[PDB]
Design a protein around this ligand. Sequence first.
Ligand SMILES: C[As](C)(=O)[O-]
Ligand SMILES: [Zn+2]
Ligand SMILES: [Zn+2]
Ligand SMILES: [Zn+2]
Ligand SMILES: [Zn+2]
Lengths: 329, 329
Amino acid sequence: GDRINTVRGPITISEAGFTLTHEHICGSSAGFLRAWPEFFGSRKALAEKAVRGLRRARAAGVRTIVDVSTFDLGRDVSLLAEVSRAADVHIVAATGLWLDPPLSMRLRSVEELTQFFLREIQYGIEDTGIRAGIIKVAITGKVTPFQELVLRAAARASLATGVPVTTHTAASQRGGEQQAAIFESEGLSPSRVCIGHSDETDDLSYLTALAARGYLIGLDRIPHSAIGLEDNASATALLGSRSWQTRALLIKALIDQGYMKQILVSNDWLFGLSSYVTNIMDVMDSVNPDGMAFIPLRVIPFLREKGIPQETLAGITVTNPARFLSPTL
Amino acid sequence: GDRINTVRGPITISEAGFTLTHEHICGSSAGFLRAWPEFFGSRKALAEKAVRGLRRARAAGVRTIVDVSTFDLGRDVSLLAEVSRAADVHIVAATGLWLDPPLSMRLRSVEELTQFFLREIQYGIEDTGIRAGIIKVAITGKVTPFQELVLRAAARASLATGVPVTTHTAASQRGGEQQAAIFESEGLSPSRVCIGHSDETDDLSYLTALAARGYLIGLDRIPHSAIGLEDNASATALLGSRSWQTRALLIKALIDQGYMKQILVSNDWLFGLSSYVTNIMDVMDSVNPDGMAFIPLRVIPFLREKGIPQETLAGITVTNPARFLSPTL
Ligand SMILES: C[As](C)(=O)[O-]
Ligand SMILES: [Zn+2]
Ligand SMILES: [Zn+2]
Ligand SMILES: [Zn+2]
Ligand SMILES: [Zn+2]
């Protein structure tokens, strides 16, 4: 209602400041960082890379990130707490399930998954005492049966705690409509929900219609735009063919439609990525050397020069995330 | 050959004693026990159940078990160390990959996987310093391209270290001939390989030809039987429709063919199982209350009653596992 849980404990809403609402310290798999830290050079090297990256974002104005790495993205909340303390950047951790659930998760009922998401919000993650402040879910296509169980569990956990739900939309086909239908069938308010990766489409009438229904629209992959990398087969299905300015103009378009309050922006960046081909992190870092500072260093000035006023940009990067993250029923 | 790695440190061959070569403390998924221990009631409840069960096996003569839980079966070597020490039963831990590799494993090359298995054998598991003493691999059907990479990396790791390889197939499946092809193409000696779950069929021709090639034959699911549970589809799918006596008669058949030295016997038991339907452990515990003591309490007397000499049975339960586990380049 007024305090948000972070990996260093509770903070008040006013302390969050400029908040990147969809980021990762490391995109990995459950148990992997512990079992094979040398994949990333070392745990130390990954930690140090993340502390520099977060200090760079901080110098560019960022005060909070939301790490939307779930259990099955290899979330290590102890790593997050360490790099949060060393960078002096708040990190909100997530519960939920992404697209790589192991069997022990895939074979669970909606009731069982609700208890798991609830334990991570109400009690803590693992034995750390660190509580999730957001629930992350993911869909592909028209939403599979298991993904629908996960969305319903996420809705039920949200209804019991007030923490919001944020999604990974992996579809070339108005992928939020089915997510909205499932959330609404559960009695969840759209204002507790961010439909993420909404910048992957140019379908403005679709985005506007979700915003008018009260959903938050995550324009959160703005720098995933590889202009010149058609020699790499795997760099096209993880970056793209539309320019970053094209994606950023969706922000202006929704503002002009009257829905600035429904917009959340971010980079979807990370400092390590083992859940993809080897050396992918080198390709990503060469295409976007700004990392998580891309939003404040590139996108905010781009929008300013297009005529968006300062107060509107503050509304999007400070006010909207605060309203979204503060637990509410 | 050499001393054997256990979760309490190196032991000599002579200390292994009566060894069960395919067992589990808990069948789960990477990260799962630490993220959701109350799935098993609690971590402490699971540890206490394991210690009670191991102590009953110990009373019945068992001195060593080989826990062939891999990374992706949720191996928690600190759990293994706790219950080994409290039950005072040696436990050999495993590296390798089973049938639920996350993205961070299944997008790796054969060289990368070789390095991961080597790390777990030569350096230690996670940050524990506990080294694996066996490499566990698993296949479905034909052997998939990824599974074939896993088998080649396991062979290379075995060649570099002398530690043996042991395998899983699905219910009623064979698969040994397809696995042996790959292992021999890498130059691995059959004397370093156990073709596990070989009690899943009654194809004696298949079993005897692998044994004649020097493979170890794992007759290691002896108590698994859903006979009398025909209305429970999940129990039947898991435990199968063959009696424990049918499975045990394969031990006698291979002895009768002259292959006593190729035989390894076990229960493939566990004290928790989250990588299957909920409450399955209740079904399994009612089928086989003896747990891991099933082999010494029931199968050994069964085979004695069939006329097999005590010395042959001692060779199978003590000498064969010692020859198999002792690292041999
Ligand atoms: C954990 As099993 C029943 O696949 O050996
Ligand atoms: Zn995503
Ligand atoms: Zn993401
Ligand atoms: Zn198995
Ligand atoms: Zn097994």
